[PDB]
Amino acid sequence: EVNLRMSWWGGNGRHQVTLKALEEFHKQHPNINVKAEYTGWDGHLSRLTTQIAGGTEPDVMQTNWNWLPIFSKDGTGFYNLFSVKEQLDLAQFDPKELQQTTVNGKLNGIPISVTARIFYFNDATWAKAGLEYPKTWDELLAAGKVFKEKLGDQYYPVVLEHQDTLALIRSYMTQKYNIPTIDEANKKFAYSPEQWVEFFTMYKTMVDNHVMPSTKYYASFGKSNMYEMKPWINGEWAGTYMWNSTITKYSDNLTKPAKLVLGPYPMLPGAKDAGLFFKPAQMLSIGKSTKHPQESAMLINFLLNSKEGVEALGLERGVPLSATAVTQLRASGVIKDEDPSVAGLNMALELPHKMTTSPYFDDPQIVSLFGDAIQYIDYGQKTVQETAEYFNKQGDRILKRAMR
Ligand SMILES: O=C(O)[C@H]1O[C@H](O[C@@H]2[C@H](O)[C@@H](O)[C@@H](O)O[C@@H]2C(=O)O)[C@H](O)[C@@H](O)[C@H]1O
Known part of the structure; x- marks a missing residue:
């Protein structure tokens, strides 16, 4: 009983x-x-x-x-x-x-189940934009201007919540440098101060190039779940870097006949590892x-x-x-x-993906710190230089407490 x-x-x-x-x-x-x-x-x-x-x-x-x-x-x-x-x-x-x-x-x-974040796109909006799905990082970053000019200021190739962004720029950094993001022996991040400059500079490039909503524009909408926002439902935010395992939470709220469709996965020439966040x-x-x-x-x-x-x-x-x-x-x-x-x-499984992600890369205080950090940047309160140092320092502190 x-x-x-x-x-x-x-x-x-x-x-x-x-x-x-x-x-x-x-x-x-x-x-x-x-x-x-x-x-x-x-x-x-x-x-x-x-x-x-x-x-x-x-x-x-x-x-x-x-x-x-x-x-x-x-x-x-x-x-x-x-x-x-x-x-x-x-x-x-x-x-x-x-x-x-x-x-x-x-x-x-x-x-x-297992899952990795990958690119899915609104096939309706991309059709109107007249663009093919990006096959390269350079294409992703070049897509924002086309959306902006062709369809309007309110149109974006993707929307990225701060946790999605964190994963995305890391995947790019793993492709380029082929090092773990977290140094577990030393309970700290592995990136040099300069690679953290490069990480936050990439964010700022994508925001300036209209790749995705800045956290300031994003905040002008409401506190809703992202998949429940008007600009998501109506196609204006035209993709997501998202767990394949929960992709219907997203594509179910699109306006028919729009679907989410698998995009290609951008891979730097010469990359040994796609830098996927692949996990249970x-x-x-x-x-x-x-x-x-x-x-x-x-x-x-x-x-x-x-x-x-x-x-x-x-x-x-x-x-x-x-x-x-x-x-x-x-x-x-x-x-x-x-x-x-x-x-x-x-x-994803066919992509080279030998590097495993430390569970500490997804520490909730690290994820919350990341959103704070790109908000510093978007609301003009810290420079990229200052945000990168801030993130490195406050992040190594969290890791120490987390890996305690
Ligand atoms: O619900 C799921 O299938 C996933 O939930 C967790 O992710 C969170 C959100 O539910 C999801 O929409 C996405 O935005 O990312 C959030 C997060 O990563 O914390 C899990 O982490 C996924 O693995 C999956 O179970």
Whole structure:
């Protein structure tokens, strides 16, 4: 007679399918009740951090890979799933994906899917602009002027939120210099002061060349989710550098007949590595002190492995890593090669991508610092030179506290 709580984040489409899956789970186990706790991405980590600090987190959580150092530096912040391998079929998940979710030999999460940020474009707006999708960084930067002149000041090749930008310029810097962004031995960023000048100078170039809204223009709209903004819905902001695993949260709010379409991935001649931010998209974890680890395990197995859970959940989290699950969704015709999300992943996997991203590159205080920094620049409060030093200094401090 078992009462479980489960949290997750995502759009309403993801909420809808998860809710149907939990109703089927309860149908399958009338002795097991699941209270569902769901929101969008915004504030979700923050609410979870409060819960975990008071020992009141859910039995089952959808978790983010970059949270592992936050909650489980020593692998003990989430229940070890090696202890519930009897309810939960672990062999369906590739051992090297499961290694991305293991900390000090403890299995902290089951990776649901993998993802990298790639370029998707509004095919309607790009058609009107008369432009081909950029194949090079130089083309991306040259696209802004064409949009601006051809279609109007309100038209932009892409919109980039600060976290997207952080990833994008890093990918460019990885292509050029082929070094990790974070030096983990020394608990600090690897870039020289000059490469940080180059990083923020690139931002300023793209903003001046009309590639994307400045953070000041972006702020003139409202506090909405980006995919919920008018200039996104009406095609004026004509693309996104986005996780393939959540691309329908974006393309579903376009004005028909507009679609998001996979763009090419810009690669500097002579680059040894595309500098993708490629990671597990999300995990399902069990609370450290859950009073029901076995029922929590059963629920995660249902959702990720069972015919019924897998069918219900569809692709609202990306392309399943579970071998049974992904085979199932291909056989039911739900996974189609031409779908932007599946095509996005295939293209990414073919890109040279040996460099892995440190979970510290996505530390929420580092991401928040980045947005502060480009806002310094856009609102004229710091020069590029000053912003680059500021970011390097304040960032190395955060890293030290984060990697503590
Ligand atoms: O919901 C997802 O599928 C993703 O959520 C997380 O990303 C955040 C937002 O949900 C997403 O719209 C994007 O803008 O980036 C945000 C972020 O990266 O923190 C995960 O980080 C993704 O891997 C994915 O699970």
